[PDB]
Amino acid sequence: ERNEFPEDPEFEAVVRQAELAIERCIFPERIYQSGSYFVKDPQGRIIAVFKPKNEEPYGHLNPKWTKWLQKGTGNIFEMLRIDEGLRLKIYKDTEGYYTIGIGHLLTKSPSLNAAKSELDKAIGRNTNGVITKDEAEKLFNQDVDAAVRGILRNAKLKPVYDSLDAVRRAALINMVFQMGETGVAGFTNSLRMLQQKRWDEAAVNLAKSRWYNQTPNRAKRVITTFRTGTWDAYKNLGRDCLVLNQGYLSEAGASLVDQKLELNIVPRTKVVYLASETFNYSAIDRVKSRGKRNRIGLPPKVGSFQLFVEGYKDADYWLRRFEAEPLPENTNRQLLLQFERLVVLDYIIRNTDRGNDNWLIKYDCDWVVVKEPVIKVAAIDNGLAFPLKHPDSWRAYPFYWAWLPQAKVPFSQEIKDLILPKISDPNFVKDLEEDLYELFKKDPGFDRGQFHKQIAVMRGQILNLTQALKDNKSPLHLVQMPPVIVETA
Ligand SMILES: Nc1ncnc2c1ncn2[C@@H]1O[C@H](COP(=O)(O)OP(=O)(O)OP(=O)(O)O)[C@@H](O)[C@H]1O
Numbered sequence: 001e002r003n004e005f006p007e008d009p010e011f012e013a014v015v016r017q018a019e020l021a022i023e024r025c026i027f028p029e030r031i032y033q034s035g036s037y038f039v040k041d042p043q044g045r046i047i048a049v050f051k052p053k054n055e056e057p058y059g060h061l062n063p064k065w066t067k068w069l070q071k072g073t074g075n076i077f078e079m080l081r082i083d084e085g086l087r088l089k090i091y092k093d094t095e096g097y098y099t100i101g102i103g104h105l106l107t108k109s110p111s112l113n114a115a116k117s118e119l120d121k122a123i124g125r126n127t128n129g130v131i132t133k134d135e136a137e138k139l140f141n142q143d144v145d146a147a148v149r150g151i152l153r154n155a156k157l158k159p160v161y162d163s164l165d166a167v168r169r170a171a172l173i174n175m176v177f178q179m180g181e182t183g184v185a186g187f188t189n190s191l192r193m194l195q196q197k198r199w200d201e202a203a204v205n206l207a208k209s210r211w212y213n214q215t216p217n218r219a220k221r222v223i224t225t226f227r228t229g230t231w232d233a234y235k236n237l238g239r240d241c242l243v244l245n246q247g248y249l250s251e252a253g254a255s256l257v258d259q260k261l262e263l264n265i266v267p268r269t270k271v272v273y274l275a276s277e278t279f280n281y282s283a284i285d286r287v288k289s290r291g292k293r294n295r296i297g298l299p300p301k302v303g304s305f306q307l308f309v310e311g312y313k314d315a316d317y318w319l320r321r322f323e324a325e326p327l328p329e330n331t332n333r334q335l336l337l338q339f340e341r342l343v344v345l346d347y348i349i350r351n352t353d354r355g356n357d358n359w360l361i362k363y364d365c366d367w368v369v370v371k372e373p374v375i376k377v378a379a380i381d382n383g384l385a386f387p388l389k390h391p392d393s394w395r396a397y398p399f400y401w402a403w404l405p406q407a408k409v410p411f412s413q414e415i416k417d418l419i420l421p422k423i424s425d426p427n428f429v430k431d432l433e434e435d436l437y438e439l440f441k442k443d444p445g446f447d448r449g450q451f452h453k454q455i456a457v458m459r460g461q462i463l464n465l466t467q468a469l470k471d472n473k474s475p476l477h478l479v480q481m482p483p484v485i486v487e488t489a
């Protein structure tokens, strides 16, 4: 609640100006180019980027999913479209029964002619197994009504149904849609627990059936729907190596890793609580804000707070110009030294999303002070890192800078002198795991099981990076090393 950071007085000062700006009604404006805002000072100057947890792509208050929110059982349509898909020609389901459109069962007969007959009757014309999308939607609407009708007609199903919330009702409709009224009623045990609100208890013994066994992926989506009562199971059906809704922790974790490695390319990021009318709040929070305690106001949202850096442009922008009109050797070397730090950071944390759009470059054209560098790099948008595992398809989530010509240059001695003494030291790696733990555990949805996997991947990255640095490998040869995890038994 209290954004205090004795370790970092400049950062705490920047946060204070953000709080003061909000009080004077200079609110952070939405970046929108979804859950990110340009935090400003009282003078209107942008001072940081803020990304609240509940507004992330998986966030419950994500403005992108709010449409889904109000509809609610009305989402059974889109829910079933995701589970059933669309096919304009007759096909066999998992049970081997003829089907068409959006999961519309035609018959249990092995005869394709009997199926075509049932189809012609349903559509009202000679289709020969082929229908249009509109015809599929019509049948789909009918099948949905029939599923609801079967529910409300049944004596065993109705009691469980009206006692359920809007979201959990769609889950029951889903089962009735797939198995029918008679079949779903056969789940006497699971139906009772659902009635008594015993969500976890029910989600367990629901997996104890041919339904789960026959179609596990579908069952898992529907069961978790019964468990959590949200639409999370249908938010991102591709497969994900990243944990659910912890992007802010990834943004902060990236800064933590960078600082301990002394990389200094990630603008300082930390977990910060902010309240702002410009943010997306629930209706219940909006109404209560105008109560009298001075008003109660809006609850401060938790999220990642990252300091804004000035003078930078897209890495794509600068790499573009450099490719055309190459930098002088001395400047290009400075650029390469920065690139190496970016490579080390992304590999250790395993950033899945680091295109030339996710890092910035600042190009500016006998003593006790070091002469200032002409070029500098900033690693931004580090919300999609610290994966639970290596991606099933590296092509889907690759290190994009690996395809850059800079990635072919061998690791300099300077980057070796900086990193090797740290990661090769098991005491350093242990403390790093500890710091990440204290940061990650703060999250309510924190899973100790997930964390051990995140660390196993990181330790696997450190293993390859250590040897790659010793062998003077380039970043490209580094990524080409077979990904591995160091798991504890
Ligand atoms: N620390 C920073 N300093 C300066 N500019 C920044 C910083 N972070 C982000 N920006 C600017 O804000 C833009 C968007 O930020 P970011 O990518 O983090 O937002 P996002 O919500 O993740 O959006 P996207 O969908 O593009 O990833 C960047 O293109 C960059 O121009």
Ligand SMILES: Nc1ncnc2c1ncn2[C@@H]1O[C@H](COP(=O)(O)OP(=O)(O)OP(=O)(O)O)[C@@H](O)[C@H]1O
Residues within 6 Å of the ligand: 394, 397, 398, 399, 400, 402, 403, 479, 480, 481, 482, 483
């Ligand atoms: N841009 C990248 N991002 C992440 N990993 C990469 C990248 N490029 C190469 N690799 C890793 O290096 C290994 C060898 O890459 P290579 O260019 O030989 O592809 P490949 O072996 O032809 O394709 P496949 O990985 O399907 O065997 C891959 O298994 C991959 O894990």
Ligand SMILES: [Ca+2]
Residues within 6 Å of the ligand: 357, 358, 381
């Ligand atoms: Ca981005």
Ligand SMILES: [Ca+2]
Residues within 6 Å of the ligand: 381, 383
């Ligand atoms: Ca992003």
